[PDB]
Amino acid sequence: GQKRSLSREALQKDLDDNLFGQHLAKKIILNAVFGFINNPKPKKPLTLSLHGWTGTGKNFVSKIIAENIYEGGLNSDYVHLFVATLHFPHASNITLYKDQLQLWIRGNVSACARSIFIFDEMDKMHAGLIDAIKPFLDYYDLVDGVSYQKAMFIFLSNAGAERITDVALDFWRSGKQREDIKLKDIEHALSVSVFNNKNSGFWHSSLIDRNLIDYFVPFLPLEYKHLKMCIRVEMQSRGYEIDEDIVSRVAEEMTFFPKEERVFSDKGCKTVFTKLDYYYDD
Amino acid sequence: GQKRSLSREALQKDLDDNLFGQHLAKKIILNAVFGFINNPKPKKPLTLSLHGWTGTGKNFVSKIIAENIYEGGLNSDYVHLFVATLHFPHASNITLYKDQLQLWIRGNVSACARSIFIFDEMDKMHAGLIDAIKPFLDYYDLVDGVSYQKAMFIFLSNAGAERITDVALDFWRSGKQREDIKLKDIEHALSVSVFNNKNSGFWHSSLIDRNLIDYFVPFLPLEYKHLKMCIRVEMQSRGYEIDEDIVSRVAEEMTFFPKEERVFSDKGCKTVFTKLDYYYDD
Amino acid sequence: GQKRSLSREALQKDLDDNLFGQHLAKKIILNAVFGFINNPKPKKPLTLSLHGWTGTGKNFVSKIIAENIYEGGLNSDYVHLFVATLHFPHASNITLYKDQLQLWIRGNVSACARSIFIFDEMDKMHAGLIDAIKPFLDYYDLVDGVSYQKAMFIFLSNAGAERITDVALDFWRSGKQREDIKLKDIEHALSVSVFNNKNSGFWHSSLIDRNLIDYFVPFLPLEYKHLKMCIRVEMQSRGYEIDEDIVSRVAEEMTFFPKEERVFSDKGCKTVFTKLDYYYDD
Amino acid sequence: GQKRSLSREALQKDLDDNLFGQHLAKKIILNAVFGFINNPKPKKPLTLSLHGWTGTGKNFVSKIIAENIYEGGLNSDYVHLFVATLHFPHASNITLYKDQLQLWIRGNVSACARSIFIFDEMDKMHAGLIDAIKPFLDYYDLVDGVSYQKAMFIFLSNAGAERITDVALDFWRSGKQREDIKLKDIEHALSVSVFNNKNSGFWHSSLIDRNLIDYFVPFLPLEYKHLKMCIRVEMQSRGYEIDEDIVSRVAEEMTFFPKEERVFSDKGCKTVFTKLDYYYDD
Ligand SMILES: Nc1ncnc2c1ncn2[C@@H]1O[C@H](COP(=O)(O)OP(=O)(O)OP(=O)(O)O)[C@@H](O)[C@H]1O
Ligand SMILES: Nc1ncnc2c1ncn2[C@@H]1O[C@H](COP(=O)(O)OP(=O)(O)OP(=O)(O)O)[C@@H](O)[C@H]1O
Ligand SMILES: Nc1ncnc2c1ncn2[C@@H]1O[C@H](COP(=O)(O)OP(=O)(O)OP(=O)(O)O)[C@@H](O)[C@H]1O
Numbered sequence A, B, C, D: 001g002q003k004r005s006l007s008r009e010a011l012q013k014d015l016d017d018n019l020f021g022q023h024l025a026k027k028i029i030l031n032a033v034f035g036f037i038n039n040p041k042p043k044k045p046l047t048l049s050l051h052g053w054t055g056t057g058k059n060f061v062s063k064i065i066a067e068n069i070y071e072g073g074l075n076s077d078y079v080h081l082f083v084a085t086l087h088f089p090h091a092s093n094i095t096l097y098k099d100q101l102q103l104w105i106r107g108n109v110s111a112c113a114r115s116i117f118i119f120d121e122m123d124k125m126h127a128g129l130i131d132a133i134k135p136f137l138d139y140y141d142l143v144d145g146v147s148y149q150k151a152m153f154i155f156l157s158n159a160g161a162e163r164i165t166d167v168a169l170d171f172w173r174s175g176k177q178r179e180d181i182k183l184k185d186i187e188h189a190l191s192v193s194v195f196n197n198k199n200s201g202f203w204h205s206s207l208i209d210r211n212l213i214d215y216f217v218p219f220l221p222l223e224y225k226h227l228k229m230c231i232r233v234e235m236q237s238r239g240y241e242i243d244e245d246i247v248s249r250v251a252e253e254m255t256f257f258p259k260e261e262r263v264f265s266d267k268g269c270k271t272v273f274t275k276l277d278y279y280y281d282d
């Protein structure tokens, strides 16, 4: 794994095995990294953006590719993780947070440029804490006698969800499935959510000062078909002895969005197996 | 005990011995933990919610299962307890309360992931004090090189009682007992009480930002039958020499709710034995 | 013995008689020395490394081969032993410790190049005390008009145990025994423990500046089968009159690791016979 | 005596004559040494641990067996004694204390391996002063061309008393005597007191790094029956002319623990005879 440059087959295989729907994410991720990781000269690190609705698999997919790259998954000493609240709660110690940030970066990357960093809960940040990293995302071949363009920086959020929602019902109201929705959607309004001078969108506004991001990538509500997928596949994978009635109860005993149609889920495949344990309790 | 994974028989036995009514709680608890504790891969810690009326046995049942798991019950070094007021009175020292919180957590859990935490008196809290724990309730296999998904976090309150009351008289007014009331009841209005921007419900509103809770579980007023149960069973268990007249006085000398029906208790089995000591005084 | 070059049969015989499990150690040791001792031109002394969990037989196996080589075992004037604490407690007298070290070396080896040195308790050392011996582990045919490449230097520790543990439950969690685990395991993480700038791992970091070590060799927790082996074999060897119930009490009256599975021992065959004397006391 | 290997009869006889209660200690000691002293190959010295409450006979029993082994008792040149405070007061001269320790050891043991050492007042020690002796408690057949595995090292303390107390009232509250309490009791919590990073328990924490101890052995409060035993037996042994009223005054004129039950003694048979001299004064 760690001694394997990821071939396309392994990743399309993995996602097609476990990922439900999200054709966009398979296309994007597969071709994007498969070009990137095979490139000995990326010219830049990987600046990925994610937002939308939960339980669609953000930390899921990040975990998966983390496992395919390194056996450590998240256990790898290379793969070192940060969080907003656990590390960076307050606007008091912003400077310490910046210095500690820069140094912990230089440590892990100076171990190897193929190390990976991820952030999470980015609705609770303070733009000084981007002001210490934009130079690291210059396409410069180096900084301080070190190159960073092999590493890969990945973000997470949920803002801008309202656009992917009302668009989802837009085309779906057109007698259509999001398979037929294309990858291109209104990246202008995404730029607004990302220009949105709310601290969530203001953070990424000052980051998008130069589109240091590579690719905006929203996920979508795992439709009740996906519920049934992560009910059948999971409970049959767990020796759970599920049957049909339990999968009548996916929709007989769940709330979807909006009420007036009862379509878009509230969790997808996040709270699915707990409620399925109720359906063991039946 | 501590070297015993709890079999179903032991727990249904215990609850059927000592717990009066609360069929819902026996079903929920028994199957829920019995699936959870036997699961070597829970994918998440146990995020339990409780609210409703007192004296129905919240701290009672938590105590019981604490004893069945570990001989320490609450004496266990693993089982380390926090309280709102005793530890976290003021909105002044919120930050210290968060840091001390995180560290005391990491201590006990780093002793073992099967440690247990409980909170109480959650009507007196401040949402910063959830903002330090939501990452711990990611389904992440780890944080900071440590996994938390085996541990079990349990909360307590009494808000939202009005719904379980007016529903209780709803179906009971229908010529019916809450045995015939099903577990499913209006979890939407429960979400409102849990969305209720009152600090009690606002706390759990920002927690229910992702339904990090597993199962909402209300208790109900221990009906005067339950009084008579925890009068006969207790006083016969205590060598008290109770007789019939003392159990005429359970209702001849007590207030129930509402007045116009005199049905729902005020304490259930909490103040029962003190008033029974009056009936020794007769 | 001392006039015997160790044939393979004698050593595989001895280990297969007395050593329980540790297939890796039989393979490694047997072929390694059997090639080494029979080699009139080793090109280097034997640079052995050991770490892991106790009571698996480090000082046991070193004792055994010491006996097979020379009748003295440890009594041999050739076989002269050093210890961290007994000889080299403080960082004050480091220089005296280095000079005395070099001279005591030159004495014993100048008696014969087939002399043996062992160290122990290597978590309490100071890198100056390797800085006097790395030249002795050049593959040079000589130093100061003397050759050292026939002698054999052996170390001991317990650091890096966490890796052999979590790996042991890794493959064992895979429905598997460590017989099916191969000798190859993650020698990268072993290099980290051996790069671990802790003084224990920093010592061996500056030693592994050139991999002057030959073979990393961890031992593993002597599984409760091995307990029962060194209960039956020992007590039947001691005329102890053991029976079945005493070997019910190996697990009825012992702690294993983790609690949640009760698998990996705490001592293996170290404290076994004392507790068995309790089972005489029964 | 010194030319006598202790037969079982002599020791069970002696303890059954003079020792009051402490069935556990008779079983442990008798079988343990009787197997040990008769063993020509112990494989280790005797690593005994003692803690609990005073006046139950620690220095008493150590004295007794010291007398049975050698006529010198404590007068023997073989039996050479150390104390924390008298010899090892300060953390200033720790090194001198270690060197003097090692040398005085080597002296007495080189006189004979059947020499005995005891320590006392071990709540006032400094872990450097174990760091010089753990090698002596390797099961090695020798060190420095000398074997130590015949000698016997014995410790004393009073920490961890709280566990033997609250357990004593646990089973005693169960309608029961500690005769019916078994030898097995919560050796986990004993390990905590012995892991207790207090210097008293931290000392023995770094010793229990390898369970170099053989057997944990607590004593218990000599119950008022034992008072009356060491009142009748002693005063009748002393020609004191005791009568009944004096043994009404054992409890009419003494404090026990807790107040609310007045059960567990404060001294047992330590201050007993002085207060009995008051009852001569009556
Ligand atoms: N598309 C999917 N197919 C199958 N299972 C999924 C899918 N998406 C999510 N899950 C499951 O749901 C759970 C939640 O996934 P994950 O945490 O990655 O979503 P998320 O967007 O990271 O949530 P949040 O945004 O709150 O961090 C996981 O346990 C995962 O296995
Ligand atoms: N269902 C029941 N059957 C028998 N006894 C009960 C029951 N419920 C409560 N009791 C008794 O009533 C007392 C109160 O129980 P408990 O404190 O668990 O209720 P609670 O909901 O925790 O109260 P609060 O909400 O005020 O903390 C206990 O002493 C318990 O033994
Ligand atoms: N695999 C085994 N089979 C049988 N007996 C064993 C085995 N391993 C250890 N023992 C016994 O356990 C005791 C401890 O062995 P030994 O001291 O060699 O372990 P160790 O790793 O050297 O301990 P430490 O690391 O603390 O020095 C010895 O008396 C030995 O006979």
Ligand SMILES: Nc1ncnc2c1ncn2[C@@H]1O[C@H](COP(=O)(O)OP(=O)(O)OP(=O)(O)O)[C@@H](O)[C@H]1O
Pocket (backbone or CB within 6 Å): D018, D019, D020, D021, D022, D053, D054, D055, D056, D057, D058, D059, D060, D061, D158, D222, D226, D230, D268, D269, D270, D271
């Ligand atoms: N079980 C017993 N039966 C009869 N006499 C006893 C018993 N235990 C103690 N004594 C008497 O009480 C006195 C105190 O005994 P001893 O000093 O051995 O207790 P200790 O635990 O060593 O005290 P400390 O812990 O303070 O050193 C002695 O004089 C002894 O004779």
